Amino acid sequence: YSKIRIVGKIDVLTGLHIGGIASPVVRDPYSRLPIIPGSSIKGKMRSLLAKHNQDAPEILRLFGSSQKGAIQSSRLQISDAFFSKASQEEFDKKDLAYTETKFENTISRLTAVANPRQIERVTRGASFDFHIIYNVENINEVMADFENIKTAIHLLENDYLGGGGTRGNGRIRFVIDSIDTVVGDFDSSNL
Amino acid sequence: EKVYQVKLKVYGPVHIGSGKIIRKQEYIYDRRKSLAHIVDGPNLVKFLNKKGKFTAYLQYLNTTKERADLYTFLRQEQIDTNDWKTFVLYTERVNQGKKGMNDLHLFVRDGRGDLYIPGSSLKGALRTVLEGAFHSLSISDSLPIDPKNLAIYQKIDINKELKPMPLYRECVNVGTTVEFTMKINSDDWTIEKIEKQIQQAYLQYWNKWFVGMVTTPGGKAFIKGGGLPSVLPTVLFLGGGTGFPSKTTHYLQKPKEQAQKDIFAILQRRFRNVYGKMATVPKNVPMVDSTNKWYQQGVCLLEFQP
Amino acid sequence: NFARKVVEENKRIVLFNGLTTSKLRNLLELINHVYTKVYNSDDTTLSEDVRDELEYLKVKFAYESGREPAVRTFIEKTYVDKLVDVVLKKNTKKIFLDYCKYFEALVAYAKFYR
Amino acid sequence: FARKVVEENKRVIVLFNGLTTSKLRNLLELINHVYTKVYNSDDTTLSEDVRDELEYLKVKFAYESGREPAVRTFIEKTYVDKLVDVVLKKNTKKIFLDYCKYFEALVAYAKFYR
RNA sequence: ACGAGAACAUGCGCGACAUUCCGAA
């Protein structure tokens, strides 16, 4: 049993909105800064991996299964991605708030009447420190699972994350600080 | 799922509304230079305190409640020209058709303060083109464009004659290429389908409304000035104020005459003051720059490249 | 705190011709912008930039007063500009919070009465 | 009394003209946050900090009334706005806890009759 | 020179497994 800890930065390219103004973005209460919930990330990668509870057996072991009579622990433990300290200091260098407001006219074609609405998005350029843990139960399946992790992250870098991304929301870019084995003897450089 | 790069060619000024309108007190404007200098809040106030004119400005506000131009205040105090430019955000060229300007509409800006065009503007314009689940159709916000391209333009109404409007809007100048990233699913929508649909949408819009504009003598003057670019393929109207008939399901889903009488009917219900009192269907409904060549507001062209 | 009696007297159903949901909003969005700035600072006393943003806050107050006389009558009745002068002198976060909670009070009571 | 008001405004199920626990979650989250503040302090009288925060609860009561019409009808019929006044008048923990029990009994019967 | 006198209701045990605040403009 080994633990390999993927620490990195998810830099947001567009207006990112995860709304838990029509919908304010979710915020960590302690610092009142915007936050990307780890469940938002994990759900998005799991859905995109499944597309690309009844899922493929590879996906079931990767993100967890709750099937009756056969329960598999989630090999992936996506944690909340908090607002980066470096990005927050970068924002403070300007007279810039961490969250912008986006407006939409929402015109109905039948009546030619537009209903205004507001969406609170984390401004473009914000960075979040993402924490990812992979649990090693089968040693021989780590390389295959990490390939599918790359597939999930690649899909995320092409897709959106939270909010209505079909209109240019929540687009992200993933950079990785280091993928090192925090507990156990597993080789980090292979992954 | 395939990724297409999208390029927008700004053949006409585009102004997306951000809900922010600023009056003349929030930005300098030189009538002789026809130039507007955008002024932010705190920088103007802190400089005013340093020069000691904060009391004088408040007195100027009290003397004239109806209108207290910032430029006239700078002229009467004879402050240094570079002092005026110290608190300036940026410089934008003004294209007035009227002389001063009453209001100034702001082009949408992100948090960082640069000009960008939202993916919801393209999503809304593209949807009206197709109409006549959209979950596959995914767009992304454009990369920021240079601030120099932003300039103030004036709305012009053409009802058998050219008529300037007191309203001003911030629009991107012509000769601009902005980039998008669009992801599509080969099942629901195809690249060939969307480009063909846009071309048909512009054509039906052209022969149902724009030709009616040309027939009137006011349209002829607009044409002779170059208002309609000779390039006009795929044509869209992203900016607001580009016209009610543009990007409508009425023209595509109804005959030319039936859609026009429905447009007149809905216009008279919404605008009872003017359209409502009209008792006849017009021959063309609705009846409604520093550079020498005139431009039509909102005119733009897409191009999708795999 | 005292906003309820203020908005009750100023109410004319709408508060006034100029105190609609959009004309007032412009003021409370500047109040919002400063409110987040003080919220994120997490300091006992307001910073110089906080005061600089407060300086424009009453400048915008007279800006809207000149544009719309209805805003001027509301501002002079609330003495809200006076509280803007009052908060700078004390120069403390809790005082700014009380002023902005009062700021949320006028708008909340205005919505409640309409 | 809590069972009476819920009974009277229970309509066929539409309660308080369309009030759900999601509409009240903003108000009650503040009310039980205030409850933990009063619960922890061993004082026969409400704290000064609690009193100012309860005043903000009164402001939020009007703000939610203006936003959601169902919540507005809920507050007026209950007099929970008036009950937040008398607890500040008496300024005692025991009266306030009776008010929190009243609001808890209110949403309890509200869920019971749905 | 008390039906007395001695005697731990005690040991092991995650409130846990899957779950995009999301589609539409």
mmCIF file of N, CA and C in Angstrom, chain A residues 39-93:
data_model
loop_
_atom_site.group_PDB
_atom_site.id
_atom_site.type_symbol
_atom_site.label_atom_id
_atom_site.label_comp_id
_atom_site.label_asym_id
_atom_site.label_seq_id
_atom_site.Cartn_x
_atom_site.Cartn_y
_atom_site.Cartn_z
ATOM 1 N N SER A 39 -14.808 18.002 -5.221
ATOM 2 C CA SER A 39 -15.869 17.190 -5.801
ATOM 3 C C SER A 39 -16.246 17.690 -7.188
ATOM 4 N N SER A 40 -16.123 18.999 -7.426
ATOM 5 C CA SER A 40 -16.340 19.528 -8.769
ATOM 6 C C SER A 40 -15.318 18.967 -9.745
ATOM 7 N N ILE A 41 -14.047 18.942 -9.342
ATOM 8 C CA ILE A 41 -13.016 18.373 -10.202
ATOM 9 C C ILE A 41 -13.259 16.885 -10.399
ATOM 10 N N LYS A 42 -13.428 16.149 -9.298
ATOM 11 C CA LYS A 42 -13.517 14.696 -9.391
ATOM 12 C C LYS A 42 -14.723 14.266 -10.213
ATOM 13 N N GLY A 43 -15.857 14.940 -10.032
ATOM 14 C CA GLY A 43 -17.026 14.617 -10.830
ATOM 15 C C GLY A 43 -16.814 14.884 -12.307
ATOM 16 N N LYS A 44 -16.137 15.986 -12.637
ATOM 17 C CA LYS A 44 -15.929 16.328 -14.039
ATOM 18 C C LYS A 44 -14.996 15.336 -14.723
ATOM 19 N N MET A 45 -13.862 15.014 -14.092
ATOM 20 C CA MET A 45 -12.954 14.032 -14.679
ATOM 21 C C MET A 45 -13.608 12.662 -14.773
ATOM 22 N N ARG A 46 -14.382 12.276 -13.757
ATOM 23 C CA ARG A 46 -15.044 10.978 -13.804
ATOM 24 C C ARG A 46 -16.068 10.919 -14.928
ATOM 25 N N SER A 47 -16.849 11.988 -15.104
ATOM 26 C CA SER A 47 -17.831 12.011 -16.184
ATOM 27 C C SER A 47 -17.156 12.002 -17.550
ATOM 28 N N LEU A 48 -16.087 12.784 -17.713
ATOM 29 C CA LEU A 48 -15.393 12.822 -18.996
ATOM 30 C C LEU A 48 -14.673 11.509 -19.278
ATOM 31 N N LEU A 49 -14.083 10.896 -18.251
ATOM 32 C CA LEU A 49 -13.435 9.604 -18.441
ATOM 33 C C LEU A 49 -14.449 8.531 -18.807
ATOM 34 N N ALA A 50 -15.623 8.557 -18.176
ATOM 35 C CA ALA A 50 -16.664 7.598 -18.521
ATOM 36 C C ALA A 50 -17.141 7.793 -19.955
ATOM 37 N N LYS A 51 -17.304 9.048 -20.380
ATOM 38 C CA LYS A 51 -17.726 9.315 -21.752
ATOM 39 C C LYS A 51 -16.679 8.847 -22.756
ATOM 40 N N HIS A 52 -15.408 9.112 -22.479
ATOM 41 C CA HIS A 52 -14.336 8.740 -23.391
ATOM 42 C C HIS A 52 -13.988 7.261 -23.254
ATOM 43 N N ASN A 53 -23.314 5.045 -11.583
ATOM 44 C CA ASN A 53 -22.494 4.144 -10.781
ATOM 45 C C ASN A 53 -21.991 2.971 -11.619
ATOM 46 N N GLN A 54 -22.758 2.608 -12.645
ATOM 47 C CA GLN A 54 -22.366 1.550 -13.574
ATOM 48 C C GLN A 54 -21.537 2.182 -14.685
ATOM 49 N N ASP A 55 -20.216 2.127 -14.537
ATOM 50 C CA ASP A 55 -19.312 2.645 -15.553
ATOM 51 C C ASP A 55 -18.355 1.547 -15.990
ATOM 52 N N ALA A 56 -17.330 1.907 -16.754
ATOM 53 C CA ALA A 56 -16.310 0.942 -17.114
ATOM 54 C C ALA A 56 -15.553 0.492 -15.865
ATOM 55 N N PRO A 57 -15.110 -0.767 -15.825
ATOM 56 C CA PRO A 57 -14.361 -1.237 -14.648
ATOM 57 C C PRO A 57 -13.098 -0.439 -14.380
ATOM 58 N N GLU A 58 -12.449 0.077 -15.426
ATOM 59 C CA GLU A 58 -11.280 0.928 -15.232
ATOM 60 C C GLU A 58 -11.656 2.206 -14.492
ATOM 61 N N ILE A 59 -12.787 2.809 -14.860
ATOM 62 C CA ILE A 59 -13.237 4.030 -14.198
ATOM 63 C C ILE A 59 -13.681 3.729 -12.773
ATOM 64 N N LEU A 60 -14.342 2.588 -12.570
ATOM 65 C CA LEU A 60 -14.874 2.257 -11.252
ATOM 66 C C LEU A 60 -13.763 2.152 -10.216
ATOM 67 N N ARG A 61 -12.655 1.507 -10.575
ATOM 68 C CA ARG A 61 -11.541 1.413 -9.640
ATOM 69 C C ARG A 61 -10.830 2.751 -9.487
ATOM 70 N N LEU A 62 -10.843 3.586 -10.528
ATOM 71 C CA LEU A 62 -10.092 4.834 -10.478
ATOM 72 C C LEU A 62 -10.754 5.845 -9.552
ATOM 73 N N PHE A 63 -12.077 5.976 -9.631
ATOM 74 C CA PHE A 63 -12.800 6.986 -8.873
ATOM 75 C C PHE A 63 -13.746 6.410 -7.831
ATOM 76 N N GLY A 64 -13.785 5.099 -7.665
ATOM 77 C CA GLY A 64 -14.568 4.495 -6.600
ATOM 78 C C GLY A 64 -15.874 3.903 -7.093
ATOM 79 N N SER A 65 -16.297 2.825 -6.443
ATOM 80 C CA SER A 65 -17.540 2.141 -6.760
ATOM 81 C C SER A 65 -18.298 1.865 -5.473
ATOM 82 N N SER A 66 -19.626 1.887 -5.555
ATOM 83 C CA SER A 66 -20.477 1.576 -4.414
ATOM 84 C C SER A 66 -21.489 0.493 -4.767
ATOM 85 N N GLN A 67 -21.144 -0.371 -5.719
ATOM 86 C CA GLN A 67 -22.043 -1.442 -6.123
ATOM 87 C C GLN A 67 -22.299 -2.388 -4.958
ATOM 88 N N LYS A 68 -23.550 -2.822 -4.831
ATOM 89 C CA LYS A 68 -23.926 -3.719 -3.746
ATOM 90 C C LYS A 68 -23.230 -5.061 -3.925
ATOM 91 N N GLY A 69 -22.577 -5.532 -2.867
ATOM 92 C CA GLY A 69 -21.846 -6.779 -2.905
ATOM 93 C C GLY A 69 -20.416 -6.669 -3.383
ATOM 94 N N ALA A 70 -20.007 -5.509 -3.899
ATOM 95 C CA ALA A 70 -18.628 -5.300 -4.338
ATOM 96 C C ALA A 70 -18.355 -3.800 -4.279
ATOM 97 N N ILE A 71 -17.662 -3.366 -3.231
ATOM 98 C CA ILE A 71 -17.347 -1.959 -3.012
ATOM 99 C C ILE A 71 -15.851 -1.779 -3.222
ATOM 100 N N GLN A 72 -15.484 -0.824 -4.072
ATOM 101 C CA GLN A 72 -14.091 -0.514 -4.359
ATOM 102 C C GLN A 72 -13.776 0.886 -3.858
ATOM 103 N N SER A 73 -12.697 1.009 -3.091
ATOM 104 C CA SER A 73 -12.269 2.317 -2.621
ATOM 105 C C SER A 73 -11.773 3.156 -3.790
ATOM 106 N N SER A 74 -12.010 4.463 -3.715
ATOM 107 C CA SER A 74 -11.578 5.376 -4.768
ATOM 108 C C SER A 74 -10.062 5.493 -4.748
ATOM 109 N N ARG A 75 -9.414 5.029 -5.818
ATOM 110 C CA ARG A 75 -7.972 5.206 -5.926
ATOM 111 C C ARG A 75 -7.602 6.674 -6.070
ATOM 112 N N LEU A 76 -8.536 7.504 -6.523
ATOM 113 C CA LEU A 76 -8.309 8.935 -6.658
ATOM 114 C C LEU A 76 -9.001 9.672 -5.522
ATOM 115 N N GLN A 77 -8.273 10.573 -4.871
ATOM 116 C CA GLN A 77 -8.823 11.422 -3.818
ATOM 117 C C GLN A 77 -8.549 12.870 -4.202
ATOM 118 N N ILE A 78 -9.432 13.433 -5.023
ATOM 119 C CA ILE A 78 -9.288 14.824 -5.428
ATOM 120 C C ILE A 78 -9.683 15.707 -4.255
ATOM 121 N N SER A 79 -8.790 16.603 -3.863
ATOM 122 C CA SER A 79 -9.046 17.512 -2.759
ATOM 123 C C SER A 79 -9.433 18.888 -3.285
ATOM 124 N N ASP A 80 -10.020 19.690 -2.401
ATOM 125 C CA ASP A 80 -10.393 21.050 -2.759
ATOM 126 C C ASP A 80 -9.168 21.819 -3.231
ATOM 127 N N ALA A 81 -9.310 22.512 -4.354
ATOM 128 C CA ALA A 81 -8.251 23.359 -4.884
ATOM 129 C C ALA A 81 -8.486 24.775 -4.376
ATOM 130 N N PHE A 82 -7.661 25.212 -3.435
ATOM 131 C CA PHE A 82 -7.837 26.517 -2.820
ATOM 132 C C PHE A 82 -7.148 27.597 -3.639
ATOM 133 N N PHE A 83 -7.533 28.841 -3.372
ATOM 134 C CA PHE A 83 -6.954 29.969 -4.085
ATOM 135 C C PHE A 83 -5.460 30.050 -3.803
ATOM 136 N N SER A 84 -4.673 30.162 -4.868
ATOM 137 C CA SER A 84 -3.225 30.177 -4.727
ATOM 138 C C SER A 84 -2.779 31.435 -3.995
ATOM 139 N N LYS A 85 -1.838 31.274 -3.063
ATOM 140 C CA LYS A 85 -1.280 32.435 -2.380
ATOM 141 C C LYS A 85 -0.516 33.325 -3.350
ATOM 142 N N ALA A 86 0.253 32.718 -4.256
ATOM 143 C CA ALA A 86 1.011 33.500 -5.227
ATOM 144 C C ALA A 86 0.087 34.288 -6.146
ATOM 145 N N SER A 87 -0.986 33.655 -6.624
ATOM 146 C CA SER A 87 -1.935 34.363 -7.476
ATOM 147 C C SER A 87 -2.647 35.466 -6.705
ATOM 148 N N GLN A 88 -2.991 35.210 -5.441
ATOM 149 C CA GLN A 88 -3.658 36.226 -4.634
ATOM 150 C C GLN A 88 -2.768 37.446 -4.438
ATOM 151 N N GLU A 89 -1.471 37.229 -4.208
ATOM 152 C CA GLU A 89 -0.541 38.351 -4.125
ATOM 153 C C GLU A 89 -0.403 39.052 -5.469
ATOM 154 N N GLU A 90 -0.445 38.289 -6.565
ATOM 155 C CA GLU A 90 -0.402 38.894 -7.891
ATOM 156 C C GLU A 90 -1.620 39.777 -8.132
ATOM 157 N N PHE A 91 -2.800 39.319 -7.710
ATOM 158 C CA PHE A 91 -3.999 40.143 -7.824
ATOM 159 C C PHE A 91 -3.894 41.387 -6.953
ATOM 160 N N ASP A 92 -3.332 41.245 -5.750
ATOM 161 C CA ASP A 92 -3.218 42.382 -4.843
ATOM 162 C C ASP A 92 -2.239 43.426 -5.361
ATOM 163 N N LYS A 93 -1.296 43.026 -6.219
ATOM 164 C CA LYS A 93 -0.410 44.001 -6.845
ATOM 165 C C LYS A 93 -1.193 44.994 -7.690
#
